[PDB]
Amino acid sequence: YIWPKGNNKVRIRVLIALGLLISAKILNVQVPFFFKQTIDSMNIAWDDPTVALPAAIGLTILCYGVARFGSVLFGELRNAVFAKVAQNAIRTVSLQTFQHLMKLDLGWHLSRQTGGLTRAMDRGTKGISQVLTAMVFHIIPISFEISVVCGILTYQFGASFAAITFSTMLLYSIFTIKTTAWRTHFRRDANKADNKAASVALDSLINFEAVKYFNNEKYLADKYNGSLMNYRDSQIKVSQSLAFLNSGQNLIFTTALTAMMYMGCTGVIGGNLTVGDLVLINQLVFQLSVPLNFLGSVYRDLKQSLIDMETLFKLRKNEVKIKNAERPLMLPENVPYDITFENVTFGYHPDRKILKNASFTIPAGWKTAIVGSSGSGKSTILKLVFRFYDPESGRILINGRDIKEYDIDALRKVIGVVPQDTPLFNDTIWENVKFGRIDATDEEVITVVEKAQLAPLIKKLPQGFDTIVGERGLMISGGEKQRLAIARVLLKNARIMFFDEATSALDTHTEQALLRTIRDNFTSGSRTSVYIAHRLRTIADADKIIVLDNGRVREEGKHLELLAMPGSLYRELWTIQEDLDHLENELKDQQELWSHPQ
Amino acid sequence: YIWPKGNNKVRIRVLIALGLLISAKILNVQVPFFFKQTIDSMNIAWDDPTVALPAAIGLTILCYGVARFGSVLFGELRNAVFAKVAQNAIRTVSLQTFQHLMKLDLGWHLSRQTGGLTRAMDRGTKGISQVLTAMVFHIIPISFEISVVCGILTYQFGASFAAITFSTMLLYSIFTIKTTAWRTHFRRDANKADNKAASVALDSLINFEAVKYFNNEKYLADKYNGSLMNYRDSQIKVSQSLAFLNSGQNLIFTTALTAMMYMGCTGVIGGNLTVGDLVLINQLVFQLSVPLNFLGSVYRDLKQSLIDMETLFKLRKNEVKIKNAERPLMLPENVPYDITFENVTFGYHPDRKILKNASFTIPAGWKTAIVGSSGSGKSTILKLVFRFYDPESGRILINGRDIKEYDIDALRKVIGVVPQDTPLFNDTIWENVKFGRIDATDEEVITVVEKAQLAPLIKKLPQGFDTIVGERGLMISGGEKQRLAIARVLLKNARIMFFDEATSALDTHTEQALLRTIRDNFTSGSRTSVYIAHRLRTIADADKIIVLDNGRVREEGKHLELLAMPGSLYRELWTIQEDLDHLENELKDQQELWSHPQ
Ligand SMILES: N[C@@H](CCC(=O)N[C@@H](CS)C(=O)NCC(=O)O)C(=O)O
């Protein structure tokens, strides 16, 4: 577990904290001596009431202060150092988890709830500032000080005292915890009712019409008042239990202290103890009560943080499935790449075979389209080319070589993707376009936004390039979004290009515009382009069309040749698809007639 | 004016805490006397060291305990009593806020963001338990004790002491706040960056594919590390400045205390002051340090909670626009209700009129339907009849009386609504059906669930009637929901009945089933039914059809007679509606073909 330190001088700082820790408590126990000695050093003659104060004691009362102040300053300095340790561990862990997170496989990321992960990794770091704080700011200081104090008690007043001091500390613990763990049975009940009343008031605000259309209002009001009164009663039991907790804690010390001052007064009669000795055993034992109040909030905290920190550790336990083998190839530099599928059988889970023994070629320089109705399996080409997944049977070759043997990072570099639904980042657009390639000159970025015909957006946008998009920002049209994606893939300048269903922008008028801006930028310039559509009309000018059916390659040719082929599937698809376009275009037209008055 | 006093004898409870407060600092200040007395009364002979302890002082050390414990015990009790005051005010405010909110008009409820209201009142109560605690648990107790201690000092030790005690108090405050206000610019910066890292890591996990489809990864890891180091470097400055604060605060009391032991020891030379008196001025002035360390978390809270208490109060400021006049009519008793529109002009925002000078009669007992294409203004009939809004020009009468003169509750009680989208409540269905009329017998609720043909749903449902429906529960189909809304209006048994676009259940077979269930329960039984439809096909059996266009009543008659009327608008609407239904029926057929892998 743990092990934030390995080979460095951060442990230098760690010793320093401990020195400042030890040396802050020494200065603390030293304070009451200076109070006792100063008391005794005044229990004398003074029949000349005009004498100045002996410096011999003037010094001793400075000592009091510069030991009182000394104790705190070294405790603060202990803290300020160790934070430079703590904040360092969190920064280092939060990154290595993130970094290892993306080295993880796609199948993994898809099962995992992204929020279950964002919490797990955040609440993972909280559980470190919870557990390193528990030790260094509380337990170790309270361990040393209690050790030292009972030590001195044995030594200077007798184990008679030390016995009851340490005993009281233990009684304090095994009352604080046995009460505190008990008293969560209220907060977990208070914020319960708080939520009950929270939900009643919310329905009553959303469904405002619904309560209006009926009687009620009063029904929901004293339904609220019901939940409100449950919560009042519950919070009342919290404030009350707290009183009991604080009174029980004080009664422990007050008697512990009171009974000792008795014990001290016998030693003043027995002549063994001075009068300062009374102040000493009082103020000595009292100085332990202060930090003892904190270490009662914890216990559960230490329980919850023990696991919440492991769950964050457990993440990096996860194994990487898709890795490049030993002696991995980079390979070809300046040739156009072709793609071939040899008997590829693949799906997610052996129950679902999606690609059933698929074989075909995607030649270099060409525009190849891959079409098929619902269930075809075109839906999984790119993912296999990008080795996101690996095929269960059969293999996939680029330029005669299996891509398994290629360097998995090298491969992915030459492939550009315009995805069906583009992601935006909570950032500037100018930072979203630049996402294509980081080292882009400002000039490159403008041209690419120009080439894509994204200009009208930034002009229409008041805050221009600096406008914030993302879920937490300004939302833009699908068209402007897909336009941005074209922009990105222009910057990346890949050799192989995928357009995975690029134009399911649910507006035909907008699809037209996008398909043109694409036919301008990606025309046969020794880029090998794969188009994956289900609207064949948008890929009719392809150099090769591969049509899949229930996971297997049925036909394979050009548009005009596939259409003319007797008994072709393409013609069935072209026909329904086209009959459909006329229909939903015709239906849109009539919705319009009914859309406005007459 | 949080008004802890009003008209009840809860102000008796209020005094007790204050009493418990007053009698708790007294028990506190006496503790150094009993410690002093015990010191002086032991500074004597004892030349017989076998004597038992004199009771005169055994009592003096008892007095110490039962004053130390008593002081706290009264402070705990002051708090547990006063919670029973605080918690009560929140409840009282939480209800009248809730109650008055529903007296507000639909337009108000529609503009205000509903979560903003839920935050406002949740954050509203925080600012009361914060300002009631700040007063009774801190400011007053520490003001009272400072006075008492400064009283004692001037009285028994001279203004010499009081001068520097009180000065230390001010020096303490007007440093802490002046420091704390400075040091907030770090937590407001740490959690700033923490949110930056938050969004980075989140974006890199949702758009995990995008970062994979591109270069980057490394780009995003050290975009995180930037924020991570922004946060680390920020969090240290939090710990560093905190150390300064606690050190700076400790310096203040340490010199103040030390300097007084000087000033005290000189009064021991002058024979004026005993040695216990050294303990006395120390511990008295020390016992003022304890609660002062908390009272530094405030000042800003006192500001933030002051406005968060004011915005929550600003709510009841809001004017109720739709209110009944003085001496409002209830009226007609056992007659069927009719509805008539006299020159009604209405819109939201006076510039954009929806209903333009509409006049028509909705005769009693009949089934009246109101149809029209978009812009018609049928879209706003119900809202006006329910006095949600009031017409700009013209009036609306039920049985000859302007509905403005009716008791707005009396009016709304006789109108039942089956809305286009029924709302669900987070509760059982049985409680959602019973919502129609609360005082319904359990049997009544059964007959209604039967009549509505809702029975099949509760049988199909796992936990039967007790099943939890709602957003944070189990969602049911539109058809089942509209089936439940029909149920509710049966329990209500209203005299006037509106079916606002009830069956735009985007599933036709389910529409047909519903219309049958409606036509069975609502047959002219001295109930006057108004249907607002846009598929005229569903209201052809009406007794009167009123057709609106661009806000004005164009034609008005029966189904067959309107159809036959030459140049009628109804035949035009009938025609578009007919073709439209025919198209989307054909389009349903064609999508199915492409929907399957054959
Ligand atoms: N001396 C106090 C510090 C009081 C204080 O201002 N604490 C900060 C920590 S930086 C805080 O967040 N207080 C609550 C707030 O101001 O919202 C303590 O350490 O217990």
Side-chain angles (χ1 to χ4, degrees), chain A residues 4 6 14-332 334-598, chain B residues 4 6 14-332 334-598:
Chain A
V14 180
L15 294 201
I16 289 178
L18 151 137
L20 283 180
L21 176 50
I22 290 162
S23 73
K25 295 306 189 166
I26 290 292
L27 267 300
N28 208 34
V29 284
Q30 285 185 357
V31 176
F33 279 14
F34 294 158
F35 199 19
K36 157 189 164 175
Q37 218 53 73
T38 191
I39 267 186
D40 299 354
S41 300
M42 297 293 304
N43 221 11
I44 63 188
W46 311 121
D47 16 37
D48 173 12
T50 63
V51 60
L53 183 92
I57 71 197
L59 164 136
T60 257
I61 86 190
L62 192 90
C63 250
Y64 166 86
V66 199
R68 201 179 172 260
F69 176 83
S71 178
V72 157
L73 185 107
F74 286 16
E76 295 317 281
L77 262 56
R78 172 206 65 192
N79 291 2
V81 155
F82 194 70
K84 200 181 296 159
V85 168
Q87 272 308 301
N88 185 9
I90 279 130
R91 180 213 124 272
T92 290
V93 151
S94 287
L95 198 68
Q96 294 179 353
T97 276
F98 175 89
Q99 286 179 287
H100 168 51
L101 266 188
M102 292 185 319
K103 296 192 166 188
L104 291 175
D105 50 279
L106 181 63
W108 188 93
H109 292 91
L110 280 158
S111 59
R112 297 282 181 155
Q113 328 86 13
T114 69
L117 256 70
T118 221
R119 303 182 303 104
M121 69 186 305
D122 162 67
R123 287 165 48 177
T125 62
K126 289 346 162 61
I128 312 187
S129 61
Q130 247 79 312
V131 180
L132 281 187
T133 267
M135 287 310 183
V136 158
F137 292 5
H138 297 66
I139 298 175
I140 303 176
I142 215 62
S143 300
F144 194 50
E145 214 182 22
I146 270 179
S147 307
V148 163
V149 159
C150 281
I152 302 173
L153 284 200
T154 271
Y155 165 72
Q156 189 166 340
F157 292 87
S160 334
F161 290 79
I164 80 178
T165 295
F166 172 88
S167 242
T168 263
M169 299 307 170
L170 264 60
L171 183 57
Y172 197 88
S173 306
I174 73 180
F175 158 78
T176 284
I177 317 180
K178 213 68 79 175
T179 288
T180 221
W182 166 72
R183 80 176 241 105
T184 51
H185 296 49
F186 295 83
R187 58 161 60 228
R188 267 166 39 190
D189 294 23
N191 64 18
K192 190 168 284 301
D194 200 51
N195 283 346
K196 265 272 173 188
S199 91
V200 167
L202 190 71
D203 287 12
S204 318
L205 253 64
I206 307 181
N207 314 7
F208 164 70
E209 294 180 69
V211 323
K212 279 306 194 175
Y213 285 152
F214 292 90
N215 20 316
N216 315 337
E217 295 139 336
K218 298 207 242 181
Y219 170 70
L220 290 196
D222 59 45
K223 201 197 196 60
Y224 196 38
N225 201 61
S227 282
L228 285 191
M229 266 161 28
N230 274 4
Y231 165 82
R232 172 206 63 167
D233 286 11
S234 218
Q235 196 65 28
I236 254 173
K237 282 183 168 297
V238 164
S239 198
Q240 284 181 347
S241 97
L242 177 71
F244 172 91
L245 174 74
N246 300 343
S247 296
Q249 280 177 341
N250 183 263
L251 187 57
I252 278 192
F253 259 72
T254 292
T255 71
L257 278 186
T258 282
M260 260 175 166
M261 194 166 56
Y262 170 86
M263 295 182 48
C265 285
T266 62
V268 156
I269 284 184
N272 319 121
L273 264 39
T274 159
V275 92
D277 275 351
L278 293 186
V279 146
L280 185 57
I281 56 187
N282 172 93
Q283 217 65 6
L284 218 63
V285 143
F286 158 72
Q287 289 175 359
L288 284 177
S289 73
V290 179
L292 216 55
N293 297 321
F294 296 84
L295 198 123
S297 303
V298 213
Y299 181 75
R300 50 136 166 111
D301 295 24
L302 242 194
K303 290 305 169 175
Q304 183 62 2
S305 299
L306 244 271
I307 45 191
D308 289 24
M309 194 185 53
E310 169 194 347
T311 57
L312 175 64
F313 284 17
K314 156 261 177 306
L315 286 203
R316 292 189 60 201
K317 128 198 141 181
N318 292 130
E319 44 212 16
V320 169
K321 283 303 183 173
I322 40 123
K323 206 194 196 294
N324 24 13
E326 201 189 11
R327 283 188 178 184
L329 315 178
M330 302 266 281
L331 281 260
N334 283 276
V335 310
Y337 307 126
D338 55 308
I339 300 168
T340 129
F341 273 46
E342 287 201 341
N343 303 85
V344 176
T345 294
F346 164 78
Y348 338 112
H349 188 326
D351 74 329
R352 305 177 201 93
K353 295 170 209 166
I354 311 297
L355 213 65
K356 312 170 182 181
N357 215 333
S359 329
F360 55 78
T361 315
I362 297 186
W366 300 24
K367 170 173 180 165
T368 314
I370 319 224
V371 304
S373 49
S374 293
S376 53
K378 57 165 190 293
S379 327
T380 90
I381 303 300
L382 168 61
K383 294 188 158 204
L384 294 169
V385 172
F386 212 75
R387 214 168 128 77
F388 270 147
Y389 297 177
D390 266 341
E392 149 195 323
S393 324
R395 58 176 170 152
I396 297 178
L397 326 166
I398 287 183
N399 295 32
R401 226 98 40 168
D402 193 320
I403 63 176
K404 275 205 179 181
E405 305 171 14
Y406 280 128
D407 170 48
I408 196 162
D409 289 277
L411 166 69
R412 292 171 167 162
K413 216 174 171 67
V414 300
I415 311 177
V417 170
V418 182
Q420 180 187 357
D421 195 46
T422 307
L424 291 176
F425 284 101
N426 292 295
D427 205 316
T428 56
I429 303 182
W430 198 93
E431 276 304 303
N432 275 268
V433 163
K434 198 192 208 310
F435 192 87
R437 209 220 338 160
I438 295 319
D439 39 317
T441 88
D442 310 84
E443 180 182 357
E444 291 180 342
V445 187
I446 309 262
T447 72
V448 165
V449 171
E450 283 173 353
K451 276 176 170 173
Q453 302 307 126
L454 233 197
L457 178 66
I458 107 177
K459 308 315 162 191
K460 133 188 291 194
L461 279 186
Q463 316 175 31
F465 267 155
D466 309 312
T467 305
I468 299 304
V469 290
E471 188 183 3
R472 311 180 296 102
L474 183 47
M475 277 178 44
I476 49 183
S477 78
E480 282 142 353
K481 252 144 71 56
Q482 300 307 125
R483 207 105 49 181
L484 184 144
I486 298 189
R488 286 183 171 147
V489 301
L490 285 173
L491 287 176
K492 184 180 175 179
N493 195 102
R495 207 89 182 256
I496 302 189
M497 199 92 52
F498 271 82
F499 295 76
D500 190 84
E501 207 90 41
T503 66
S504 299
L506 199 46
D507 25 38
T508 285
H509 188 288
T510 325
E511 185 188 34
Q512 240 68 25
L514 251 186
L515 290 155
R516 300 189 244 117
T517 62
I518 298 192
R519 89 158 303 265
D520 298 348
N521 292 264
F522 299 102
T523 301
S524 298
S526 223
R527 320 171 78 64
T528 121
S529 340
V530 186
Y531 289 61
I532 311 232
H534 82 302
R535 293 195 235 229
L536 300 76
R537 167 196 56 184
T538 79
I539 51 99
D541 63 333
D543 294 311
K544 178 161 171 179
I545 298 186
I546 299 179
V547 18
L548 299 177
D549 194 38
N550 225 102
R552 352 189 71 114
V553 179
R554 205 167 143 164
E555 299 151 8
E556 203 200 71
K558 301 252 270 296
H559 168 76
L560 241 32
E561 120 191 1
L562 244 40
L563 266 175
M565 187 177 291
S568 96
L569 173 63
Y570 190 94
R571 251 211 61 91
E572 278 298 329
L573 298 179
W574 182 272
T575 292
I576 313 174
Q577 218 77 42
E578 237 190 7
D579 293 334
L580 204 106
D581 295 348
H582 181 77
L583 224 43
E584 55 187 22
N585 220 77
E586 193 166 2
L587 174 61
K588 186 191 58 183
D589 279 18
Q590 286 247 351
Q591 289 173 356
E592 162 65 27
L593 267 51
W594 207 90
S595 106
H596 58 79
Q598 309 307 337
Chain B
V14 172
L15 293 200
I16 293 177
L18 153 136
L20 283 178
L21 175 48
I22 294 231
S23 71
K25 295 302 189 166
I26 295 179
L27 268 196
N28 206 33
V29 290
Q30 292 184 3
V31 181
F33 282 11
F34 299 151
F35 203 20
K36 159 194 162 178
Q37 214 49 68
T38 196
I39 268 188
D40 298 351
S41 301
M42 297 293 302
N43 222 13
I44 63 189
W46 315 119
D47 19 39
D48 171 12
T50 68
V51 67
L53 188 92
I57 70 196
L59 167 137
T60 255
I61 88 190
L62 193 91
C63 254
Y64 170 87
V66 194
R68 201 180 172 263
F69 171 77
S71 175
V72 164
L73 182 106
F74 285 19
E76 293 316 280
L77 262 55
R78 174 208 66 192
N79 288 4
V81 158
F82 193 73
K84 198 179 293 163
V85 172
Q87 269 310 304
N88 184 274
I90 279 75
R91 178 208 125 270
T92 294
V93 159
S94 286
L95 201 68
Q96 295 182 354
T97 282
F98 175 87
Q99 291 181 290
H100 173 269
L101 269 187
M102 290 187 317
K103 298 190 167 188
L104 292 174
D105 47 273
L106 180 63
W108 190 93
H109 282 280
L110 283 162
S111 64
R112 305 285 183 156
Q113 330 94 17
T114 65
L117 259 68
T118 224
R119 302 183 302 104
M121 63 189 304
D122 167 285
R123 286 169 49 181
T125 71
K126 288 345 159 62
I128 303 189
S129 60
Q130 249 76 308
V131 180
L132 282 187
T133 269
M135 293 310 176
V136 164
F137 293 1
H138 300 71
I139 295 177
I140 299 178
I142 212 61
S143 298
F144 188 49
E145 220 182 26
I146 269 182
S147 303
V148 166
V149 162
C150 279
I152 298 173
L153 286 201
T154 273
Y155 168 74
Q156 186 163 338
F157 295 84
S160 335
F161 291 103
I164 88 175
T165 292
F166 176 88
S167 245
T168 266
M169 300 310 171
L170 261 56
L171 187 58
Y172 194 95
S173 306
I174 77 179
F175 156 80
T176 280
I177 317 180
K178 213 69 137 173
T179 281
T180 220
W182 161 72
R183 80 170 238 100
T184 49
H185 292 44
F186 296 83
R187 61 163 60 223
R188 265 168 38 200
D189 293 23
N191 62 18
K192 189 172 281 6
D194 201 46
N195 280 347
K196 261 265 178 185
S199 92
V200 168
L202 192 72
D203 289 12
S204 316
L205 254 67
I206 319 177
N207 318 6
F208 162 70
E209 293 178 70
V211 318
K212 278 306 194 175
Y213 286 155
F214 288 95
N215 19 314
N216 314 337
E217 295 140 334
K218 302 209 318 180
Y219 169 74
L220 286 194
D222 58 47
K223 196 197 192 61
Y224 194 42
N225 202 64
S227 282
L228 283 191
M229 265 160 29
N230 278 5
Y231 171 80
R232 169 200 60 163
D233 290 11
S234 218
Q235 195 64 26
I236 244 177
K237 287 243 175 58
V238 171
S239 200
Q240 284 176 348
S241 97
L242 181 71
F244 172 97
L245 177 77
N246 297 343
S247 300
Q249 279 182 342
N250 183 263
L251 186 61
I252 281 193
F253 263 76
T254 297
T255 74
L257 273 187
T258 281
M260 257 165 161
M261 193 161 53
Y262 171 86
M263 293 181 47
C265 284
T266 69
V268 161
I269 290 180
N272 320 118
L273 262 37
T274 161
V275 97
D277 275 347
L278 293 183
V279 145
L280 180 55
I281 56 187
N282 173 261
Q283 219 63 2
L284 221 63
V285 142
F286 165 77
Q287 285 177 357
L288 285 179
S289 80
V290 177
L292 218 55
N293 302 323
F294 299 172
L295 194 124
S297 300
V298 214
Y299 193 78
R300 52 131 289 107
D301 290 22
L302 240 196
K303 280 301 171 174
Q304 182 62 4
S305 298
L306 243 269
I307 39 191
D308 281 18
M309 189 182 48
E310 174 189 352
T311 58
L312 175 65
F313 284 17
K314 158 263 183 306
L315 287 204
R316 293 195 61 195
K317 131 200 145 179
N318 292 129
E319 261 205 18
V320 170
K321 284 304 184 174
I322 39 121
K323 204 194 337 291
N324 17 7
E326 203 183 8
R327 279 197 168 190
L329 320 180
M330 297 265 280
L331 285 316
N334 287 282
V335 313
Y337 302 143
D338 56 21
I339 303 168
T340 124
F341 273 47
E342 292 195 342
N343 301 285
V344 182
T345 299
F346 163 76
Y348 333 102
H349 190 326
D351 69 332
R352 304 176 203 91
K353 291 175 208 166
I354 311 295
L355 213 63
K356 314 176 180 187
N357 210 114
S359 328
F360 56 78
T361 243
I362 295 186
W366 298 18
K367 171 176 178 168
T368 311
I370 318 224
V371 293
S373 50
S374 290
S376 49
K378 57 161 189 288
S379 325
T380 87
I381 300 300
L382 166 59
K383 295 187 161 202
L384 291 168
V385 177
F386 210 82
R387 212 168 125 74
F388 270 142
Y389 303 78
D390 269 341
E392 148 189 323
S393 327
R395 57 182 164 162
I396 294 180
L397 325 167
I398 291 182
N399 290 32
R401 300 99 188 255
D402 191 324
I403 53 178
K404 276 199 180 180
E405 304 171 14
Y406 281 140
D407 176 48
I408 197 162
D409 285 277
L411 168 69
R412 291 172 166 163
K413 213 174 168 67
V414 302
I415 305 177
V417 167
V418 196
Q420 175 184 353
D421 192 46
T422 308
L424 294 175
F425 279 97
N426 293 297
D427 203 319
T428 54
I429 313 179
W430 198 88
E431 277 300 305
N432 273 270
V433 164
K434 196 193 205 179
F435 184 85
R437 208 221 336 158
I438 299 321
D439 38 316
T441 91
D442 311 82
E443 182 177 355
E444 289 183 340
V445 187
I446 309 261
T447 85
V448 163
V449 172
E450 285 171 353
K451 277 173 172 172
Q453 305 300 268
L454 235 199
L457 176 64
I458 99 177
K459 305 314 161 190
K460 141 191 294 193
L461 277 189
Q463 321 172 36
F465 260 150
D466 307 312
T467 311
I468 301 299
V469 284
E471 189 176 1
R472 309 180 291 102
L474 185 46
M475 279 175 44
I476 49 182
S477 75
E480 279 142 350
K481 247 140 68 55
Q482 299 309 122
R483 206 107 54 181
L484 182 139
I486 296 189
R488 290 179 170 149
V489 307
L490 284 171
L491 283 173
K492 185 180 178 177
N493 195 21
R495 210 92 183 260
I496 301 190
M497 197 90 51
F498 274 85
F499 296 76
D500 187 76
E501 211 94 35
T503 62
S504 301
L506 200 46
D507 30 41
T508 280
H509 184 293
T510 327
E511 179 189 31
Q512 258 68 27
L514 253 185
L515 291 154
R516 301 189 300 122
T517 63
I518 299 192
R519 88 164 306 267
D520 294 351
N521 294 266
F522 298 101
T523 305
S524 301
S526 226
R527 320 171 81 71
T528 127
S529 342
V530 184
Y531 293 64
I532 312 234
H534 83 306
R535 297 192 238 167
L536 297 74
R537 164 195 59 188
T538 79
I539 50 100
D541 64 335
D543 292 307
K544 178 161 171 178
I545 296 188
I546 296 180
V547 18
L548 302 177
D549 196 38
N550 218 111
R552 354 189 77 121
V553 188
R554 219 160 150 161
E555 299 153 7
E556 200 195 65
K558 301 253 271 297
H559 170 76
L560 242 34
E561 125 198 4
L562 243 37
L563 267 177
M565 186 178 288
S568 100
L569 174 62
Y570 190 100
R571 219 211 64 100
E572 283 302 327
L573 298 180
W574 186 271
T575 297
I576 317 175
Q577 215 73 224
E578 233 190 8
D579 295 334
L580 207 105
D581 294 351
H582 179 80
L583 229 42
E584 55 190 23
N585 220 73
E586 191 164 2
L587 175 59
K588 187 199 58 182
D589 279 23
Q590 290 253 354
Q591 283 169 347
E592 162 67 33
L593 266 44
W594 202 88
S595 108
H596 53 82
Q598 309 174 343

